[PDB]
Design a binder for this molecule. Structure first.
Ligand code: HEA
Ligand code: HEA
Ligand code: PC1
Ligand code: PC1
Ligand code: PC1
Ligand code: PC1
Ligand code: PC1
Ligand code: PC1
Ligand code: 3PE
Ligand code: 3PE
Ligand code: 3PE
Ligand code: CU
Ligand code: ZN
Lengths: 49, 111, 196, 161, 51, 54, 157, 165, 495
C-alpha cells in the first residue's frame, strides 16, 4: 500500500525549503499588490507610469 | 547482478557526527553559502527595522510629484475608453464605484 | 484484424532485403553438379558422399583422441605487448626470395585466368545493368558523363583551367573599370567633362 | 525479455499538440470579445479553470516518463532546453527595460512644471525625483527575495552534496 | 450511435469489437468442446438495406 | 572568482542596502521643514496676489 | 555517531539499463572526435612503428577484414560508413555512409577494404524491478530466447 | 574562466569534469559504486535478514539464498555490537558486499510508486491514458474550446452576441 | 467508417513524428504561398490600370492598403518560413545526423498547430470582417493605433496573429538547436554535420534572440490601441516602435535566406557528384552573416532623424555584412565548376537563376546600404525591386530547387522535366519583367504603397503588365503540373 507519511514528509529537507519559499513568494506578491493599489498616485496611463 | 539490489537494500554508513547535517557543514562551499545568508540576515535586515524604530514617530516630508496641471484636465481631448467599458484605471477601486463598471456582467458560460 | 502474420520468420521488407543468391540467379533451372562434380550421376554422388562422410568421421575421432591424450613436453606462450588482445600475426604476405616470386607469379597467372577476369566482366555487366535500370525516363542517365568526358587531375585542372580563367577575369576587370569610367564621365582622370 | 532501442527518446503521440494551441486561441478570442462588447463571453474563473486543467497533463506524463524513459542523454537535452527558456525570459525582460528606459536616459524633456534653480526651494529636484515610488516597501520586498535566493541556494547545494 | 455511448461511460472498459455477451460465451464454449450433438446455428444474415 | 570574492561582494551589497535605507529615511525626515516652509510661502503669496487683484 | 543511508535512484527502464552495464551503453553513446587541420598536419608526418607494415596483411584484407557491430533486429541491413579517404583516390571531405546486409563480407571498391558489419540484438531482461540479483542459469533464458526467436518481443521505445 | 563557466575542463585541458567539493558530483558512480568521495569520513558497518520479504510480489522474483545473504538494520541508531569496515576508494566491489549491514528501503513511497507503475497498473503506452477520467476531461476541454472559438467568431463578425436570442 | 475517420484525424492531429510534421508544414506553406500570390495578382491588376480601375474610389483605397499589408505578412511569415525551415527542417534534420526524432517531440506538434491557429485567425480577420488592417506589413504607429480606418478588433486579431507566429518560430528554433547539439550518431563532430544543419542552427539562434523584442513592440501596439496609453502617440516615440520592430526585422530576413543557402549546398552536393568547394569557408561565412546581422537593424531608418554618427556606423556595418555573402557566392561559383551536374534538370537551371538573381539583388541592396544614397531611395520602388529580386527570385528559386529535387524522394515518382521547364522559365521571365523596371522607377522617383501614379511612370507599369500576364501563365502551369504529378494516365491505345 501507498500511504502518505506526514512524519517522513516533515523530516525531509526539500519539502520544508520549498514550502518556506512558496510562503515568502506569496508574502511578496501580497505586499507588491498592496503598493500598486493604495500607495502610488500615477497609473498605467502616463509616461513613466 | 542488477544494481537494483542496492536500490532495494542500500548499505548503511557510519558517521562520527551526531547527524549528517553537522557532517555536511564541514564543506567550505556550504559554509560560504551560510555566511552569505548570515550577512544578509545580520546587516540589512536588523538595520532596516532599526531605522523603522529610529524614525517611528516622524513624518515623511518628501514633496509630492506633479502629474497633470489644471489646464490639461482634458488630456488634449484624448479617448479614454478602457477595455472594461468605463473610464477608470484598473486598480482605482473607489473611482469604479462611482461608475459602477461591474453592472455589465456576462454569463457564466456561452449562454 | 485482417490477415495477421503467424510467427516472426524473416520477411523481405524495407528495413531488410536479405543477401542475394547470385548462384541461383545465374544457374536457374540448370544443375550445378555437372560443374562441381563433373561426370558423376546422382547415385554416384550420393555413394561418394556417404563414403567420404564415414572416412571423415573416422579421421575426426582419431584426431580428437590424439589431441586429448598426448603428454605435454613443451609450452609455447607467444610474446605480446601489454593491453593487446591478440599477438601479431607472424605470417607475411610479401614474397622474399625469387622462388617465392615465381610461385606467386604462377598463382597470379592462374587467378587472372580463372578468378579476376570473371570479376571484371561481372562488374562491367553490373554497371551497364544499373544504367539500363535508370534509363527510359526513370532517372538521370545520359544527362552528364559518358565515355567522352574529359577527366583531369587536380594539378592539371588548376594549372590549365583555373589560373587562365582568373587571368581573363582580372583583365576584364581592369578594362571594364577604365571603359565604364570613361563612358559615364567622358574623361579618364578628370571626372565629368565640360564641367570641371 | 525486451528489445532495447537507441538511447534517444522515441516520443509518444499526445493531445498536447493541439490543446495548447487551442488554449492560446481561446485566450486571444476571449480578449477580442472583451474588447468588442466590454463583457466576458465566459466567466474568467471558468476560463482559468479550463486553462489549469488542460496543463495538468505535463506533470503526469513527466512522472511516468521519468519512471520509465530517462537517461543522461535525455537529461542533458532537458537541461539545455531549460537553459534556452531562461535565456528567452532574460531577453523578454531586456526588451521591457528598453521600453522603460527609452525616455529616461534621454535627459532633456518637456515638462508641465519648472525645474530650474533659484526660483523655488523645491523646483530644482522636480524632474530628477519621483518621490512617491514606495522605496521603503520596495526594500522590504528586496529583503524577502534575497532570503528566498540564499535559502534556496543553500538547500540545493546541501542536498546535492 | 447509442452503442458507442454505452461503452464510453467506462473509459477503461471494453469496446464494441471486444465485448462478449453471456450467450456468445456459451456458444463459443460449446463450439470449442467438440461435442457431437452441438449442432451449430447460423447467425442472422442481413442484406444491404437491413444493415 | 572564488567563493571568498562572492562573500565579499555580498557584504558590499549589504552595506549598500543599509546605506540606502538610512539615507532614504533621513532625507524623508529632513525635508519636512523645507516643504512646510515652501507651503507657507506659496500660501502667503497666493493670498497676497488675490488681495492685490481685488 | 550516526547511521546515514544515501537515497538510491529508483528510476527503472532505460535508466536502469544504463546503470546496469555502463561500459556497453557508454560505448553506444560516447562521442569521439576527429582531427582538426593542424592535427591532420601533425599526424601525416608521424612515422610508422617498425617495418611490419611492409610484410604483414593490413587491417581490411580479404583474410583480415574490418568487423563492426551494430544493434538492431536480426536480418536488418546495417548502416556503416567511412570518414573518407581510406585511399588516395577516395573522397575525404565528409563521411560517406553505406547500407549493407548483415553478417556478409562486403568490399568497398572505393578504398579497397573488406568489412563485416554485423548485428547483435540488445535482448535484456524486462526492467521492472524483477531483474535477477544473482547468477542466473540457462533454463529461464532458454525459454525467453525461444519465444523471441519464434515470435519476437516488444521494443523499448 | 569561460571554460569552467560553461562546464568544461578549465585552464588545464587534460582535467576532469567533476568537482564534488562544491556539489558537482557523479550520479552514475554514486548509483553504481556508491559515493566514493565520502570514503574517508564514512565506514561500513559489519556484524534480521531479508528472507522475511521473500513472499512479497516484487521480491519473490529473487532466490531465497539471495535474500538470506542480505542483512538488515533499523537504519536510525548505530548497532553497538556492529564492527566498522573501512571504505576503500578505487574498489568497485565493496559497495556490493553481502557482509555489510543494509536498510530495507522497500516501504519508501517512491519505491512503492515506481513498482506500482510497473506492477500495480495495466500497462498503457501513453501516460495520459494511464489516467482514464483525466483524459476524458481533457478531450472534453478540447471540444469546449473549439465550440467557444466558433461561437466567438460568429458573434463578433455579425454584431449580435447570442444573448438576446 | 467512424473508426477510419477518427484514425485519420488523430494521425494528423496527435502526431509527434518529424516526417509527418514536415509534410504538414510544407503543405501549409504552399497553400499560404498561393493565397499570397492571388493577393499579389489583385495588387498588380490595381497598378496596371489607370483611373482606380478596381477600387473606383479614393475613399476605398483602404482596400488596396489591406491588400499590400496582408500580401506582405502572408508571404513573409506564412509562406517562406514554413516551407524553407518548417518543411525541410523537420523532415531532414534528424535524418542527416542519424537520429530518430527531434528532442522535445511534443513541442513540434505544438509549433505546427500554433502556426495553424495563427493562419486561421488571420484569414478570418482579414476576409470575413469589415475594414481590416491597412498599415503595411510594418505596422507603424500612429497609423496602426490612432486611425479612423483602424478601429475594429480585426487589427487586434492580426497583431495577436503576429504573436502566435512568433511563438511557433521560437519553439521550432529551440527544438532544432537542442536536437542538433546532443543527438548526433557516434563519430560525427559538431562542425562535420551537414551544411544544412548548421544553417538551421544559426537561423534558430537568430530567431531566439530577436523575437521577444518584436513581442514587446506588438504588445506596445495592443496597449496603445486598447488601454489608451501614449507609448507611440504624440507624447510617445513612434521611433521607439521602429527601433524595436527593426531590431527584429533584419534578423528575420537573414533567417529567411540562410536555410535556402543550406538547402542549395546540400542539393548541389547531391546533383553535381562533387563536394562543396570550401565547405569550412561556407559554414563560417554562414555563421558570420548570422552574427553580423544583429548590428545593422537601423539601416531601415536612415530618414527618421538618426544621429549622423549613427548613420555612418550603420552604413559601415552593412558593408561589413556584405563581405561574407560575396565569399559565399564565389564558393558556389567554384563549386559548380568541374562538376557533372545534370544538363536537363530543373534543379540545375533553378540554381543558375538563383545565383544570378541573388547577386543582382545583393548589389542593389548594397547600394541602399549607404546612408547618404538612401536619402534618394527610401520608400521608393527601388526598395521593392530589391527585396523582390531577393525574396521572389532567389529564395523562391532555392525552394524550387528543393521542390524539384525532393519530390521523387518523398513520393517515388519522377518529374516531368519539360513541363517543369516551362514553369521555371516562364516564372523567371515573368518576374524579371515585373521587378526589374521597379529599380529604374525608384530612381526616377516613384513612391511605394500607392495605387495611382503620375503619368511620367507609364512605361514601367506597362512592362509590369507584361510580366504579370507571364506570371499568371507560369503559376497556372505549376499548379497543373503538380495535379498531373499525382494522377494516373488519361489516354492509352494501341499502336
Ligand atoms: C517572401 C515574400 C514575398 C513573395 C514571395 C512576394 C511575391 C510577389 N510580390 Fe510582394 N511583397 C512582399 C513580400 C513578397 N512578395 C513584402 C514584404 C512587401 C511589402 C508589403 C508592404 O509594402 O507593405 C511586398 C509588396 C509587394 C508590392 C507592393 C506594391 C506597392 O507597394 O506599390 C507588389 C506589387 O508589385 C508586389 C508584387 C509581388 C508579386 C507580383 C509576387 C509574385 O507573384 C512573383 C513571384 C511569384 C511566385 C510564383 C511566388 C509565389 C509562389 C507560389 C506559387 C507558391 C508555390 C511555392 C513555391 C514556388 C516554392 N509585392
Ligand atoms: C531574404 C531577404 C533579404 C536579403 C537576403 C536582404 C539583404 C540585404 N539587404 Fe535588404 N530588405 C529586405 C529583404 C532582404 N534583404 C526586405 C524584405 C526589405 C524591406 C523591408 C521594408 O522596408 O519593407 C529590405 C530592405 C533593405 C533596405 C532598406 C532600404 C530602405 O528601406 O531605405 C536596405 C538598405 O540598407 C537593405 C540592405 C540589404 C543589404 C545591404 C543586404 C545584403 O545582405 C546583400 C549583400 C549581398 C552581396 C553584396 C552580394 C555579393 C556581392 C558580391 C558577389 C561581391 C561584391 C562585393 C563588393 C563590391 C565589396 N535591405
Ligand atoms: C494573455 C495573458 C493573460 C491576460 C492578459 C494579461 C496582460 C494584460 C495587460 C494590460 C493590463 C492593463 C491593466 O488593467 O493593468 C492594471 C495594472 C495596474 O494598472 P494601474 O497602475 O494603471 O492602476 C492604477 C493604480 N493606481 C492606484 C496607482 C493609480 O497594470 C499592471 O500591473 C501592468 C501589467 C501589464 C502586463 C505585464 C505582463 C506582460 C504582458 C504580456 C507580454 C507578452 C510579450 C511576449 C508575447
Ligand atoms: C538579467 C536580466 C536583466 C534585465 C533588465 C535590464 C538589465 C540592464 C541592461 C539592459 C540593456 C539593454 C536595454 C537597454 C538598451 C536600450 C536603451 C534605450 O532606450 O536606448 C535608446 C536611447 C536613445 O533614445 P533617443 O535619444 O533616440 O530618444 C529617447 C526618446 N525621445 C525621442 C522621446 C527623446 O539611448 C541610447 O540610444 C543610448 C545608447 C544605447 C545603449 C544604452 C545602454 C544602457 C546601459 C544601462 C546601464 C545601467 C543598467 C543597470 C541600472
Ligand atoms: C551581476 C549579474 C550576475 C549574473 C550571474 C549570477 C550567478 C552568480 O553570480 O553565481 C555565483 C554566486 C556564488 O556562487 P558560489 O558561491 O557557488 O561560487 C562560485 C563557484 N566557484 C567558486 C567554484 C567558482 O551565486 C550566488 O551567489 C547564488 C545566488 C545567485 C543569485 C543571482 C544574483 C547574484 C548576484
Ligand atoms: C559564448 C556562448 C557559447 C555557446 C553557448 C553556451 C553553451 O552552449 O553552453 C553549453 C553548456 C553545456 O554544454 P555541454 O553539455 O557541451 O557541456 C558539458 C560538457 N561535458 C559533457 C564534457 C561535461 O551549457 C551551460 O554551461 C549552461 C547553459 C548555456 C547555454 C544557454 C542557452 C543559450 C542559447 C543561445 C545559444
Ligand atoms: C513572440 C514572443 C516570443 C518569445 C516568448 C518568450 C517567452 C517564453 C516562451 C517559451 C516557449 C518555448 C519553450 C522552449 C522549451 C522549454 C522547455 C521544454 O519544452 O521542455 C520540454 C518539456 C516537454 O518536453 P516533451 O514532452 O516534448 O518531451 C521531452 C522528453 N522528456 C519529457 C522525456 C524530457 O516541456 C514542458 O514540459 C513544458 C512545461 C509545462 C508547462 C508549460 C507549458 C507551455 C507550453 C508551450 C507553449 C506556451 C504558450 C504560451
Ligand atoms: C535566348 C537565349 C537563352 C535564354 C535562357 C538562358 C537561361 C538563363 C538561366 C536561368 C535558367 C532558367 C530556366 C531555363 C530553361 C531552359 C533554358 C535554355 O534554353 O537552356 C538551353 C540553352 C541552349 O542549349 P543549346 O541550344 O546549346 O542545346 C543544343 C545542345 N545539344 C547538342 C545538347 C542539343 O542552354 C545553354 O546553351 C546553356 C549552356 C551554354 C553552353 C553552350 C554549348 C553549345 C552546345 C554544344 C554545341 C556544339 C559545340 C558548339 C561550340 C560552343 C560555342 C558556343
Ligand atoms: C473557426 C472555428 C474553429 C476555431 C478553433 C480552432 C482553431 C484552429 C485549429 C486549431 C487546431 C485544431 C485541430 C483539430 C482538433 C480536433 C479534435 C481532435 O483532434 O481530437 C482528437 C481526440 C483524440 O482523443 P484520444 O484521447 O487521443 O483518443 C484516441 C482514441 N481513443 O479526440 C477527441 O477529442 C474526440 C474526437 C474529435 C474528432 C474531431 C472533431 C469532430
Ligand atoms: C549580440 C547582439 C547585440 C545587439 C546590439 C548591438 C548594438 C550595436 C550598437 C547600435 C547603436 O548604437 O544603436 C544606436 C541606437 C540609437 O541611435 P539614435 O537614436 O540614432 O541616436 C543615439 C541616441 N540619440 O540604439 C538603439 O536604438 C537602442 C540601443 C541599441 C540596442 C540595444 C539592444 C540590447 C540587447 C538586446 C538583446 C540582444 C540579444 C542577442
Ligand atoms: C495550340 C494551343 C492552344 C489550343 C487551343 C486552346 C485550348 C488549349 C488547352 C487548354 C488547357 C491547357 C492544356 C492542358 C495542360 O496540361 O496545360 C499545361 C500547359 C503547360 O504547357 P504549355 O504552356 O502547353 O507549353 C507548350 C505551349 N503550348 O498549359 C498551361 O499550363 C497553361 C495554363 C492553363 C490553361 C488552361 C486553363 C483552364 C482551362 C481553359
Ligand atoms: Cu535589413
Ligand atoms: Zn573508405
Amino acid at each position: 500500500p501507498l500511504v502518505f507519511d506526514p512524519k517522513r514528509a516533515f523530516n525531509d529537507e526539500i519539502f520544508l525549503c520549498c514550502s518556506l519559499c512558496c510562503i515568502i513568494f506569496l508574502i511578496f506578491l501580497f505586499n507588491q499588490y498592496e503598493e500598486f493599489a493604495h500607495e502610488l498616485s500615477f497609473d498605467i496611463r502616463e509616461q513613466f507610469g | 547482478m542488477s544494481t537494483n539490489k542496492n536500490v532495494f537494500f542500500p548499505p548503511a554508513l557510519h558517521l562520527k557526527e551526531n547527524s549528517i547535517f553537522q557532517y555536511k557543514f564541514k564543506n567550505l562551499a556550504v559554509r560560504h553559502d551560510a555566511a552569505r545568508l548570515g550577512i544578509i540576515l545580520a546587516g540589512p535586515t536588523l538595520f532596516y527595522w532599526f531605522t523603522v524604530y529610529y524614525f517611528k514617530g516622524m513624518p515623511n516630508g518628501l514633496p509630492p510629484v506633479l502629474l497633470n496641471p489644471f489646464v490639461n484636465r482634458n488630456y488634449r481631448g484624448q479617448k479614454r475608453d478602457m477595455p472594461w467599458g468605463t473610464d477608470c484605471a484598473f486598480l482605482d477601486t473607489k473611482c469604479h464605484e462611482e461608475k459602477d463598471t461591474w453592472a455589465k456582467r456576462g454569463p457564466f458560460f456561452i449562454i | 484484424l485482417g490477415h495477421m502474420r503467424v510467427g516472426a520468420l524473416w520477411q523481405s521488407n524495407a528495413n531488410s532485403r536479405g543477401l542475394p543468391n547470385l548462384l541461383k540467379e545465374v544457374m536457374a533451372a540448370e544443375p550445378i553438379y555437372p560443374y562441381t562434380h563433373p561426370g558423376l550421376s546422382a547415385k554416384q554422388i550420393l555413394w561418394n558422399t556417404k563414403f567420404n562422410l564415414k572416412l571423415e568421421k573416422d579421421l575426426i575421432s582419431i584426431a580428437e583422441s590424439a589431441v586429448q591424450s598426448q603428454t605435454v613436453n613443451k609450452v609455447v606462450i607467444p610474446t605480446m605487448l601489454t593491453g593487446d588482445v591478440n599477438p601479431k600475426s607472424p605470417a607475411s604476405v610479401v614474397a622474399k626470395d625469387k622462388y617465392q616470386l615465381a610461385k606467386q607469379m604462377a598463382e597470379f597467372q592462374y587467378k587472372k585466368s580463372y578468378f579476376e577476369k570473371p570479376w571484371g566482366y561481372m562488374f562491367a555487366y553490373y554497371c551497364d545493368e544499373d544504367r539500363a535500370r535508370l534509363c527510359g525516363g526513370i532517372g538521370y542517365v545520359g544527362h552528364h558523363g559518358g565515355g567522352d568526358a574529359e577527366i583531369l587531375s587536380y594539378t592539371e585542372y588548376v594549372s590549365t583551367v583555373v589560373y587562365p580563367t582568373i587571368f581573363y577575369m582580372a583583365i576584364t576587370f581592369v578594362v571594364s573599370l577604365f571603359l565604364m569610367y570613361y563612358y559615364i564621365y567622358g574623361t579618364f582622370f578628370s571626372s565629368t567633362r565640360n564641367r570641371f | 525479455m525486451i528489445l532495447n532501442t537507441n538511447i534517444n527518446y522515441g516520443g509518444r503521440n499526445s493531445r498536447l499538440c493541439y490543446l495548447i494551441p487551442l488554449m492560446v486561441h481561446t485566450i486571444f478570442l476571449y480578449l477580442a470579445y472583451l474588447i468588442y462588447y466590454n463583457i466576458n463571453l465566459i466567466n474568467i474563473y471558468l476560463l482559468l479553470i479550463i486553462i489549469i486543467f488542460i496543463n495538468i497533463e505535463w506533470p503526469l506524463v513527466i512522472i511516468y516518463e521519468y519512471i520509465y524513459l530517462t537517461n543522461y542523454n535525455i537529461q542533458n537535452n532537458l537541461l539545455y532546453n531549460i537553459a534556452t527558456f531562461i535565456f528567452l525570459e532574460i531577453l523578454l525582460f531586456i526588451g521591457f527595460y528598453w521600453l522603460y528606459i527609452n525616455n529616461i536616459i534621454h535627459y532633456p524633456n518637456n515638462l508641465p512644471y519648472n525645474n530650474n534653480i533659484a526660483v523655488n526651494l523645491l523646483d530644482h529636484l522636480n524632474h530628477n525625483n519621483n518621490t512617491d515610488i514606495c522605496l521603503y516597501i520596495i526594500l522590504h520586498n528586496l529583503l524577502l527575495l534575497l532570503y528566498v535566493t540564499l535559502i534556496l541556494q543553500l538547500v540545493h547545494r546541501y542536498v546535492q552534496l | 450511435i447509442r452503442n458507442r455511448l454505452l461503452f464510453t461511460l467506462n473509459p477503461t472498459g471494453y469496446t464494441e469489437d471486444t465485448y462478449v455477451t453471456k450467450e456468445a460465451l456459451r456458444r463459443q464454449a460449446l463450439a470449442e468442446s467438440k461435442n457431437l450433438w452441438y449442432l451449430p446455428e447460423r447467425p442472422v444474415v442481413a442484406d444491404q438495406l437491413e444493415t | 572568482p572564488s567563493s571568498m570574492a562572492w562573500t565579499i561582494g555580498w557584504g558590499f551589497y549589504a552595506a549598500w542596502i543599509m546605506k540606502e535605507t538610512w539615507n532614504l529615511r533621513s532625507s524623508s525626515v529632513g525635508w519636512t521643514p523645507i516643504t512646510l516652509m515652501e507651503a507657507y510661502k506659496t500660501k502667503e503669496r497666493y493670498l497676497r496676489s488675490k488681495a492685490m487683484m481685488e | 555517531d550516526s547511521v546515514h543511508v544515501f537515497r538510491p535512484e529508483f528510476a527503472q527502464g532505460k535508466f536502469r539499463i544504463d546503470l546496469d552495464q555502463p561500459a556497453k551503453q557508454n560505448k553506444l553513446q560516447q562521442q569521439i572526435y576527429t582531427l582538426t587541420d593542424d592535427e591532420r598536419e601533425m599526424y601525416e608526418d608521424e612515422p610508422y612503428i617498425g617495418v611490419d607494415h611492409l610484410y604483414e596483411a593490413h587491417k581490411g584484407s580479404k583474410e583480415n577484414p574490418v568487423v563492426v557491430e551494430a544493434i538492431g533486429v536480426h536480418g536488418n541491413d546495417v548502416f556503416t560508413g567511412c570518414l573518407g579517404g581510406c585511399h588516395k583516390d577516395a573522397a575525404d571531405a565528409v563521411a560517406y555512409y553505406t547500407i549493407v546486409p548483415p553478417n556478409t563480407l562486403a568490399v568497398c571498391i572505393d578504398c579497397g577494404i573488406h568489412f563485416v558489419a554485423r548485428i547483435n540484438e540488445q535482448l535484456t531482461f524486462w526492467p521492472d524491478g524483477t531483474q535477477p540479483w544473482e547468477k542466473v542459469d540457462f533454463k529461464a533464458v532458454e525459454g525467453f530466447l525461444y519465444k523471441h526467436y519464434k515470435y519476437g518481443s516488444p521494443l523499448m521505445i | 574562466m569561460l571554460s569552467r563557466l560553461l562546464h568544461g575542463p578549465g585552464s588545464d585541458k587534460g582535467h576532469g569534469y567533476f568537482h564534488p567539493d562544491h556539489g558537482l558530483v557523479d550520479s552514475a558512480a554514486q548509483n553504481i559504486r556508491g559515493p566514493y568521495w565520502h570514503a574517508e569520513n564514512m565506514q561500513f558497518m559489519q556484524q534480521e535478514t531479508a528472507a522475511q520479504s521473500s513472499k512479497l510480489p516484487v521480491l519473490s522474483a529473487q532466490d531465497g539464498k539471495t535474500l538470506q545473504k542480505i542483512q538488515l538494520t533499523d537504519g536510525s541508531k548505530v548497532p553497538k555490537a556492529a564492527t566498522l569496515v573501512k571504505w576503500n576508494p578505487k574498489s568497485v566491489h565493496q559497495w556490493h558486499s553481502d557482509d555489510i549491514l543494509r536498510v530495507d528501503m522497500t516501504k519508501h513511497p517512491e519505491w512503492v510508486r515506481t513498482m506500482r507503475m510497473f506492477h500495480g497498473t495495466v500497462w498503457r503506452h501513453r501516460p495520459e491514458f494511464r489516467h482514464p477520467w483525466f483524459s476524458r476531461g481533457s478531450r472534453a476541454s478540447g471540444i469546449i474550446m473549439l465550440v467557444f472559438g466558433a461561437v466567438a467568431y460568429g458573434e463578433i463578425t455579425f454584431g449580435k452576441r447570442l444573448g438576446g436570442v | 467508417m467512424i473508426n477510419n475517420i477518427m484514425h485519420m484525424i488523430n494521425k494528423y492531429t496527435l502526431t509527434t513524428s518529424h516526417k509527418i510534421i514536415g509534410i504538414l508544414y510544407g503543405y501549409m506553406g504552399y497553400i499560404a504561398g498561393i493565397l499570397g500570390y492571388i493577393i499579389s495578382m489583385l495588387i498588380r491588376m490595381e497598378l496596371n490600370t489607370q483611373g482606380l480601375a478596381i477600387v473606383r474610389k479614393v475613399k476605398e483605397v483602404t482596400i488596396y492598403n489591406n491588400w499590400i499589408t496582408i500580401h506582405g505578412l502572408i508571404m513573409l511569415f506564412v509562406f517562406i518560413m514554413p516551407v524553407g525551415i518548417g518543411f525541410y527542417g523537420n523532415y531532414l534534420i534528424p535524418m542527416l545526423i542519424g537520429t530518430s526524432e527531434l528532442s522535445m517531440p511534443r513541442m513540434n506538434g505544438i509549433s505546427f498547430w500554433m502556426l495553424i491557429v495563427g493562419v486561421v485567425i488571420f484569414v478570418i480577420s482579414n476576409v470575413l470582417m469589415s475594414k481590416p488592417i491597412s498599415s503595411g506589413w510594418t505596422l507603424y504607429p500612429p497609423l496602426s493605433t490612432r486611425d479612423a480606418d483602424n478601429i475594429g478588433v480585426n487589427i487586434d486579431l492580426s497583431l495577436l496573429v503576429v504573436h502566435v507566429l512568433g511563438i511557433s518560430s521560437t519553439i521550432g528554433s529551440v527544438n532544432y538547436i537542442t536536437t542538433n547539439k546532443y543527438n548526433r550518431h557516434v563519430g560525427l563532430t559538431f562542425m562535420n554535420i551537414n551544411i544544412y544543419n548548421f544553417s538551421i542552427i544559426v537561423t534558430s539562434i537568430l530567431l531566439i534572440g530577436s523575437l521577444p523584442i518584436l513581442g514587446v513592440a506588438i504588445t506596445g501596439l495592443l496597449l496603445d490601441r486598447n488601454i489608451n496609453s501614449t507609448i507611440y502617440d504624440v507624447i510617445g516615440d513612434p521611433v521607439l516602435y521602429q527601433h524595436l520592430f527593426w531590431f527584429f526585422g533584419h534578423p528575420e530576413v537573414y533567417v529567411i535566406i540562410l536555410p535556402v543557402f543550406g538547402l542549395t549546398s546540400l542539393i548541389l552536393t547531391s546533383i553535381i557528384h562533387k563536394d562543396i568547394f570550401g565547405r569550412e569557408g561556407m559554414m563560417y561565412c554562414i555563421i558570420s552573416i548570422g552574427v553580423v546581422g544583429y548590428f545593422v537593424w537601423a539601416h531601415h531608418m536612415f530618414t527618421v532623424g538618426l544621429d549622423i554618427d549613427s548613420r555612418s556606423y550603420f552604413s559601415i556595418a552593412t558593408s561589413i555584412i556584405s563581405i561574407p555573402t560575396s565569399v559565399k557566392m564565389f564558393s558556389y561559383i567554384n563549386t559548380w565548376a568541374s562538376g557533372r551536374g545534370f544538363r536537363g534538370n530543373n534543379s540545375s537551371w533553378s540554381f543558375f537563376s538563383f545565383l544570378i538573381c541573388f547577386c543582382f539583388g545583393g548589389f542593389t541592396g548594397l547600394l541602399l546600404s549607404s546612408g547618404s544614397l538612401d536619402i534618394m531611395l527610401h520608400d521608393t520602388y527601388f526598395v521593392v525591386g530589391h527585396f523582390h529580386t531577393v525574396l521572389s527570385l532567389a529564395a523562391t528559386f532555392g525552394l524550387l530547387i528543393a521542390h524539384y529535387f525532393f519530390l521523387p524522394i518523398i513520393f517515388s515518382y519522377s518529374i516531368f522535366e519539360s513541363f517543369s521547364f516551362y514553369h521555371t522559365f516562364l516564372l523567371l521571365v515573368g518576374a524579371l519583367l515585373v521587378f526589374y523596371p521597379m529599380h529604374l522607377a525608384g530612381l526616377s522617383g516613384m513612391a511605394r504603397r500607392v495605387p495611382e501614379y503620375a503619368d511620367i511612370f507609364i512605361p514601367f507599369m506597362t512592362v509590369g503588365f507584361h510580366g504579370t500576364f507571364l506570371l499568371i501563365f507560369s503559376t497556372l502551369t505549376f499548379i497543373r503540373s503538380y495535379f498531373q504529378f499525382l494522377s494516373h494516365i488519361n489516354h492509352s491505345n494501341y499502336l
